[PDB]
Design a protein around this ligand. Structure first.
Ligand SMILES: Cc1cc2nc3c(=O)[nH]c(=O)nc-3n(C[C@H](O)[C@H](O)[C@H](O)COP(=O)(O)OP(=O)(O)OC[C@H]3O[C@@H](n4cnc5c(N)ncnc54)[C@H](O)[C@@H]3O)c2cc1C
Ligand SMILES: Cc1cc2nc3c(=O)[nH]c(=O)nc-3n(C[C@H](O)[C@H](O)[C@H](O)COP(=O)(O)OP(=O)(O)OC[C@H]3O[C@@H](n4cnc5c(N)ncnc54)[C@H](O)[C@@H]3O)c2cc1C
Lengths: 473, 473
């Protein structure tokens, strides 16, 4: 598991009011925030929690691992629970949806055991996350009133909760499910494509765009990832807009503008949107509905905070407010918010959208902006790349080539992003680029950065130094 | 190999000066400097090189690899040579030791083919490196006039040149060599101890200090490494000062202030000191004798630079001038001196003493100051550490524990160093810390740094984040 004690920000409460803090949502962001408040300021504040689901902390990435038989079962895909939060001092109401907030009276109303439950608060923290987007596809609809995204058509699956994952695992126990279509080639769909193929199904990955992982890796790497999937039995249907999902009583065929595929199941991995309705317009929202928050995760309403996927985050690569739905950001915004609502002044430092993906032996990582996105967003970006073996050629075993791409602002010279891909795990190296971007390090300064040398680990003239020195523009 | 075109610093000679540039020494630092000058400013300058040895670019780290038989031979241990430098445009005199310098007439006097050769210069760049340290030990003497560190006593070996390595190898063909004594428990001595053990020799590792690797790791990790060596039969004799190496015509035993050992071969790996004799007292020196240089690698004599093992370097961990004999520094200082010497203003950024070591499957990396070293320097330091598995417990294979230590200043909160140990390669990780120290990142800021999450690579609450968040002091 993963549980600690007091963080290093924990400030001595001099003369601050003892606040009653209500948290809406106790998943990845909520749990992080709650535990931080309890393990750091304990009894000084009354923590009350509401979550409409029946479970919390389910690791989304566990869905593909489970389906792809990379792990025996669901055990371990949860790292905390109600009992764990109560043992730290929180009062937890599960399966209790908060349905309205009164910012003037400072109360929230939730549905506890079918009955309006009113709870007062001094500080309010929204950790309501997001929910999957239903695309305009004929035949794709959710059963009215469903709270677990259940499609009306049998075998049309959504991605979001543990229930959704178990649903698929169970259905897959049906020998009639031989062909699966995965809609959306972002990292979620890519992993699910591999997962289904690994389970032994026929998979067709469909996306309106011409390649996979378009928002995080440049064409060289996405092409590589696509080739990787193809060489494993996954059929690629890029550049196709899904029109309809048909069948008689269950999924039987998916129709795009360029083809028709016979399939026994369709998975929608098209993205999510923030759950901010409780705001009731009283709170400033980002263009996508996310609660707009400053670096202390505070909303436009004092004493009201938003964290995780229901709120924005500061992107150091673009140097603007942004929206990055990642468990990593959920944990940090939760930690930042916890300290502030408890009276400790703590400014967040922004994020770079660092991410990693591992598909059939191909390991990739990236952080910041790809060259294409940097340009599309108006930066005079350039990229410097290099492909070389990780270790000196004289090393007899465990060597392998690594490709690195360092994107930088030709103008200001600051690093805007980096990408790495290799057949072995070099993911630890992306951390340096995350920090580099956060700190505003230039491609020039980076080139001279002290990168150690040991033949067992790298080359004297390693690919990082070489890529940086090779910068042109 | 490891060659390239122009660096990103290559500045267009608006209206600069071309110079006659003489380089003394063409090994790691020299070759890096020479190639940078010739590759970026080609014909604008005239480059003459002098090196007293008969070969250059030999990677010292391969010595242990060679003896311990982890690699085929020494072939890939060279990455450049006389012909490559000359074909780049430099005049190269191999086996030509510069015996004196006239700073007034701006001439160097070398011994070329038994006769003196006077070369005039506009700019002088010292890359004379270092030579092995030889404390006063009875029976330990280098042959008079030997420029190859050949001991007068048969089987008393030094660790410096390719020839030294080739020598030991040849001597190991002598069935009589059964037990080896390694003097010096730094990384070189530890690596050689493993190498001789692998060759099936009986090894006794001797050091004045109570532990191995005292300069780069804290007692925890060094104790771990000690046990690692003992686990393979290496006898440790720490806390002992070698007083004499005895033998009737050849090494028969070595004696310390606490004991005596019967050995057949003795290797001295006590350390290195700068070769700055040519300074002739006209150039300011550092406490240890190294040419004292600034951020541009220039000595106290305008037009005269010094790089690599013969000069100092700026340490961002201590935030002061320091001496750190590493190839990584040789390379970077050489690149900076090249640009500056050729008219391109380029200020160096300093180094952190980043380093790595791999012995019997135990991989460790460190950068900056250890807690003990920080304190030995007067820093009010503290360390925050953590040990946990690399990935979630639910991961089937490839998981392993990692121990991380982060040393910081209790007052400024500035990060001073970091160490990592695991039985799987997490070396890429030390780079982020090396950059952190360079950029003066605080432990609080580091705790909030964007570290991605992907079950295949790490845990949501990874050990770096956890360690940082746990800064108690
Ligand atoms: C298949 C998949 C794979 C992923 N893989 C990775 C990965 O490998 N690495 C990574 O960093 N990220 C990954 N993510 C993203 C990560 O899971 C999300 O960023 C994270 O779950 C967001 O956490 P959150 O707490 O902000 O929101 P959510 O997970 O959306 O949780 C919000 C919580 O609040 C509750 N709630 C909402 N409204 C109310 C209400 N009105 N009243 C009471 N309770 C309410 C909900 O029940 C829920 O428990 C993945 C996501 C998916 C779907
Ligand atoms: C066994 C061993 C293992 C090592 N492992 C690592 C490691 O894994 N990682 C790492 O980063 N570093 C390592 N190092 C350190 C690294 O080798 C040195 O930091 C580096 O060699 C210094 O390069 P240099 O060019 O400054 O000096 P040197 O290598 O000392 O070379 C100086 C050159 O100048 C010439 N010269 C000297 N005086 C004169 C003169 N008067 N006239 C003409 N020519 C002259 C010499 O012949 C020589 O070629 C190791 C060293 C050893 C011995």
């Amino acid at each position: 598991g993963q549980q600690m004690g007091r963080t290093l920000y924990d400030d001595d409460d001099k003369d601050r009011w003892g606040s009653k803090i209500v948290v809406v949502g106790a998943n990845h962001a909520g749990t992080a925030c709650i535990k931080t408040m309890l393990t750091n300021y304990g009894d000084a504040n009354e923590i009350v929690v509401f979550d409409q689901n029946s479970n919390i902390s389910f690791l989304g990435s566990g869905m593909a691992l489970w389906i792809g038989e990379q792990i025996a079962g669901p055990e371990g895909l949860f790292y905390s629970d109600k009992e764990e939060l109560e043992s730290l001092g929180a009062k937890v109401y599960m399966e209790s949806p908060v349905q309205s907030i009164d910012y003037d009276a400072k109360t929230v109303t939730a549905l506890v055991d079918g009955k309006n439950h009113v709870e007062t608060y001094d500080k309010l923290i929204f950790a309501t996350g997001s929910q999957p987007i239903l695309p305009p596809i004929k035949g794709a609809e959710i059963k009215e009133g469903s709270l677990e995204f259940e499609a009306t058509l049998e075998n049309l699956q959504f991605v979001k909760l543990y229930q959704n994952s178990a649903d698929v695992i169970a259905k897959l126990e049906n020998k009639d499910i031989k062909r699966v279509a995965v809609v959306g080639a972002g990292y979620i769909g890519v992993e699910l494509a591999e997962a289904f193929q690994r389970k032994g199904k026929e998979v067709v990955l469909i996306d309106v765009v011409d390649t996979c992982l378009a928002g995080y890796y440049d064409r060289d790497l996405t092409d590589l990832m696509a080739k990787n999937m193809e060489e494993h039995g996954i059929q690629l249907a890029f550049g196709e807009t899904v029109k309809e999902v048909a069948g008689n009583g269950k999924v039987e065929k998916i129709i795009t503008d360029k083809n028709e595929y016979d399939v026994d199941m369709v998975i929608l991995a098209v993205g999510f949107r923030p759950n901010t309705t409780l705001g009731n317009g009283k709170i400033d929202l980002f263009r996508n509905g996310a609660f707009l928050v400053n670096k202390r995760q505070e909303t436009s309403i004092p004493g009201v905070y938003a964290i995780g996927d229901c709120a924005t985050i500061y992107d150091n690569a673009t140097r603007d407010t942004n929206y990055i739905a990642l468990a990593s950001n959920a944990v940090r915004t939760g930690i930042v918010a916890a300290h502030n609502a408890c009276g400790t002044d703590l400014e967040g430092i922004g994020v770079q959208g660092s991410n990693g993906i591992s598909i059939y032996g191909l390991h990739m990582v990236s952080t910041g902006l790809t060259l294409e996105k940097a340009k599309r967003l108006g930066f005079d970006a350039a990229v410097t790349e290099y492909t070389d073996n990780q270790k000196p050629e004289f090393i007899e075993h465990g060597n392998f080539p690594v490709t690195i791409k360092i994107v930088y602002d030709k103008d200001s010279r600051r690093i805007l992003g980096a990408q790495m891909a290799a057949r072995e795990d070099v993911s630890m190296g992306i951390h340096m680029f995350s920090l580099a971007i956060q700190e505003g390090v230039t491609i020039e300064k980076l080139a001279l950065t002290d990168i150690f040398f040991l033949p067992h680990f790298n080359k004297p003239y390693n690919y990082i130094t070489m890529a940086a020195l090779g910068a042109k523009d």
